[PDB]
Design a protein around this ligand. Sequence first.
Ligand SMILES: C=CC1=C(C)/C(=C/c2[nH]c(/C=C3N=C(/C=C4\NC(=O)C(C)=C4C=C)C(C)=C\3CCC(=O)O)c(CCC(=O)O)c2C)NC1=O
Ligand code: NA
Length: 243
Amino acid sequence: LSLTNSSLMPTLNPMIQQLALAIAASWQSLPLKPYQLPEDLGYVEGRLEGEKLVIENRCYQTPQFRKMHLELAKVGKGLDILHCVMFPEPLYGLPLFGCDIVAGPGGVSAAIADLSPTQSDRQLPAAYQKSLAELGQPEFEQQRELPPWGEIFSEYCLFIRPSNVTEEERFVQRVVDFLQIHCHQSIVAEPLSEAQTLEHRQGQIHYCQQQQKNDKTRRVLEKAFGEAWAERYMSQVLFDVIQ
Ligand SMILES: C=CC1=C(C)/C(=C/c2[nH]c(/C=C3N=C(/C=C4\NC(=O)C(C)=C4C=C)C(C)=C\3CCC(=O)O)c(CCC(=O)O)c2C)NC1=O
Ligand code: NA
């Protein structure tokens, strides 16, 4: 979370850099422990017939968060990606924090962030609903419609192409605000009932299964590493289905 040793960071899109710093700052003083990814993955790169893909993975856990994954990536010289998920411990019933930012030479093309539900009714907990409403409706000029698998995302999900610096900063601040709410809610949460824990586990399984339908991510991985590698990475590293 000291992103000071990151080889990628100095070379990434400025909005990505600010988000990475914001996420690292959110996590820095938590009761962190390492979370070992499959094969204790950290840095990885690959190429097949086209551009090289370079990826840095950082991953932690706390008693409330099963797995806190920050991924940074670059395809060739110019396509930059930040991926982050905080997977909740089902025992505590917290939503899933996620964000995905994709940028090229033309600027940021996609910025997505959410606190996604795990309840069977597909609603966020009452406390989240309240705190999120209090932020107000952000104005963004270029909204994007989620794909069908994106039914997993809350009504507060952002999915935009930022139109200018003001919007980039507004999006980053909204992600900061989501993280602030999420970290606070995490400390007022108690272990839930076995039936409730099971419900929340299912919500997290479903989230991962749906995220795996994102062909935009899959194609980037496949072009650099191939089908089998990409399937392993999506299903075991990015969106692992708990059980
Ligand atoms: C290896 C990691 C990684 C790669 C390579 C990656 C690539 C990536 N994700 C994308 C979109 C996207 N990404 C998501 C969302 C998410 N994606 C998430 O990983 C999470 C946690 C969310 C949501 C919280 C959505 C909704 C789209 C748009 C998909 C579409 O347009 O069909 C796009 C298309 C960008 C655009 O259309 O402008 C690419 C290239 N994303 C990645 O995370
Ligand atoms: Na390299």
